[PDB]
């Protein structure tokens, strides 16, 4: 008799969730620094356990035995990637004590010596070389906001932090355009495996 | 009845697994050309969100849930109309399917090997930057296939919906065996 009420609750909750995913697939993948980012963090964090709970709900009230097998497989692999994310994130937080190690996109961080401090942001575009652009007192490294750095005070060495190694990167070559802008690159030297 | 909600639960878990696969991969893995995944999931999830909001508005728990479902239906309609307007405005001008990217107002055309390669660029300044790293080219954060540093074009184009902007090779440098950097700047804009 109360099937209609739980059906309406499920419809309302999943409509809100499907709205929350839709403003993450669009509007959130270009803008990756400040705006439409808390929504992306919430969706990408609750993405794995809600899928695990959905496979658990499918396994609890199943259709066939093959449905039980595939739902158990999906729940097991979802728990496997969630456990792997928590292991890699705990390792990265233990190696580098920053909250930015707890994001679910990548397990690599970029540390830049800006202004007497070190600014840490997640780094998805990891390769041998890391580029850096300046916008006349506004600096972006690998598509990430990094403050308001100038060009004459560019850092000569940045680091990236992984769960296993810490890789140093020295500034090899730079070119200046405009009044205060510039573009520099950072190539790898001296990986340190603590 | 009974079996119907079981099939509904199985279908919901399966489609949430494809949403799981498409969100964690494709775009933020290594940025290759499998962006059709996000496109096909977004084209599935726009009328899915419309249908769920409409069905929640048709049979509401109360008035507040009805007005919230109507608000999210109008929001999904507004964002779908905005996406179609901004993508149709970039398809009558350029003959590239990368205008159907979820958020794109510029397209970067880079010629090498006798062919141009079009990528859905997100935002460009007045001076874009090419980075060649081994046998691979990255231009404004987009993986432009494989291209050597010495065979880098001295002219690229970017196609805004109202203008065509021509960028030319202003500066260049090399540091590795075939790895290098390059700075392109605008010299002439063309009114569409």
């Amino acid at each position, epitope marked *: 008799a109360q099937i209609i009420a739980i059906i309406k609750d499920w419809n309302f909750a999943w409509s809100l969730i499907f709205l929350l995913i839709t403003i993450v697939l669009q509007y959130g993948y270009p803008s990756r620094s400040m705006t439409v980012y808390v929504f992306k963090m919430f969706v990408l964090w609750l993405l794995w356990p809600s899928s695990m709970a959905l496979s658990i709900f499918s396994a609890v009230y199943p259709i066939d035995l093959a449905s039980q097998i595939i739902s158990g497989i999906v729940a097991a692999v979802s728990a496997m990637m969630w456990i792997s994310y928590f292991v890699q994130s705990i390792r990265l937080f233990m190696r580098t004590g920053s909250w930015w190690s707890f994001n679910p996109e990548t397990n690599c961080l970029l540390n830049v*010596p800006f*202004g*007497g*401090t*070190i600014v840490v942001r997640p780094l998805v575009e990891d390769s*041998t070389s890391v580029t850096a652009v300046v916008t006349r007192g506004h600096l972006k490294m690998a598509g990430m906001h990094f403050g308001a750095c100038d060009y004459d*005070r560019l*850092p*000569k*060495e940045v680091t990236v932090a992984k769960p296993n*190694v810490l890789i*140093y990167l*020295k500034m*090899v*070559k730079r070119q200046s355009y405009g009044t205060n802008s510039g573009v520099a690159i950072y*190539s*790898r*030297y*001296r*990986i*340190g*495996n*603590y | 009845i009974i079996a119907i909600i079981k099939d509904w639960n199985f279908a919901w878990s399966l489609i949430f697994l494809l949403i799981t696969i498409v969100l964690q991969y494709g775009y933020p893995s290594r940025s290759m050309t499998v962006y059709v995944f996000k496109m096909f999931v977004l084209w599935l999830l726009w009328p899915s969100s419309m249908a769920l909001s409409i069905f929640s508005a048709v049979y509401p728990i109360d008035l507040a849930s009805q007005i919230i479902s109507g608000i999210v239906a109008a929001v999904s309609a507004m964002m779908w109309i905005s996406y179609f307007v901004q993508s149709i405005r970039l398809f009558m001008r350029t003959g590239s399917w990368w205008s159907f990217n979820p958020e794109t107002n510029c397209l970067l055309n880079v010629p090498f090997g006798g062919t141009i390669v079009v990528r859905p660029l997100v935002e460009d300044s007045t001076s874009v930057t090419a980075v060649v790293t081994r046998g691979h080219l990255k231009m404004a954060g987009m993986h432009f296939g494989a291209c050597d540093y010495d065979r880098l074009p001295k002219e690229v184009t970017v196609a805004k919906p109202n203008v065509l902007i021509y960028l030319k090779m202003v500066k260049r440098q090399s*540091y*590795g*065996t075939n790895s290098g950097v390059a700075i392109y700047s605008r010299y002439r804009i063309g009114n569409y």
Partner: antibody, heavy 113, light 112 residues
Framework: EVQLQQSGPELVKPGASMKISCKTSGYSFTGYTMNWVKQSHGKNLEWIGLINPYNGDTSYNQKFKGKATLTVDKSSSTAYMELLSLTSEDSAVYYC??????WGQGTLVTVSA | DIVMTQSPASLAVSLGQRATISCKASQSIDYDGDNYMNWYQQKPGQPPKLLIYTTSNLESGIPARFSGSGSGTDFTLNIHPVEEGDAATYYCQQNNEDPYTFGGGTKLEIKR
């Protein structure tokens, strides 16, 4: 202009403790990892250890673990290496570097009675 | 832990002639896809000056007379245009594992 001036030559008793002060100038001090290298009698270079100035995290050689300690002073923009329990096999020249390019002037340490 | 030896002890190379310094290690220095051996030059009474970063690259301000080659275990520093300001001692460093073991050092003197 990155410069790393050291303290100067010192003579110490065989079994005392002493400190080399590598003073830097020119760059933003917190952020470039300082690396200490020891050059022995004649021409033989040995790595002592690196230290992050901002984080304070160190990394030592196996032979120099506990023999020398690396400290950072951010206010004077300096780093220090303390050598303890000096022996006859410690009379060596000590260099400080940052990005393996800008080295120090060199401190000659003599250990004799 | 890493034992590094250099095959030449002292060099006898005139002006304009090839000078080869070989620094063969024993372990694998390659991380990911790059060998990390640094090549250093030291004049007497001076701290060492870095020439080669990652087995191939060159220091900015160091001329292209010095070249680095080799991969895996065998490495070579090569100078075709040996000039007058060249007599020094050259070193190799792994820059990959923890102890950062320097080389034995090769003394290069210009034949007169």
């Amino acid at each position: 202009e990155v410069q790393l001036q050291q303290s100067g030559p010192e003579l110490v008793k065989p079994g005392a403790s002493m400190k080399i002060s590598c003073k830097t100038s020119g760059y933003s001090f917190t952020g470039y990892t300082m690396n200490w290298v020891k050059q022995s009698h004649g021409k033989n270079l040995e790595w002592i250890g690196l230290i992050n100035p901002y984080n304070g995290d160190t990394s030592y050689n196996q032979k120099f673990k506990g023999k020398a300690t690396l400290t950072v002073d951010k206010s004077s923009s300096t780093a220090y290496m303390e050598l303890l329990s000096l022996t006859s096999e410690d009379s060596a020249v000590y260099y400080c570097e940052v990005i393996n390019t800008y080295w120090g002037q060199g401190t000659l340490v003599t250990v004799s009675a | 832990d890493i034992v590094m030896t250099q095959s030449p002890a002292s060099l006898a190379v005139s002006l304009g002639q090839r000078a080869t310094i070989s620094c063969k290690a024993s372990q694998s220095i390659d991380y990911d896809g790059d060998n990390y051996m640094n090549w250093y030059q030291q004049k007497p009474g001076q701290p060492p000056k870095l020439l080669i970063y990652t087995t191939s690259n060159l220091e900015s301000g160091i001329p292209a007379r010095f070249s680095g080659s080799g991969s895996g275990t065998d490495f070579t520093l090569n100078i075709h245009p040996v000039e007058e300001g060249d007599a020094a001692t050259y070193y190799c460093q792994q820059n990959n594992e923890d102890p950062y073991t320097f080389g034995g050092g090769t003394k290069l003197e210009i034949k007169r």
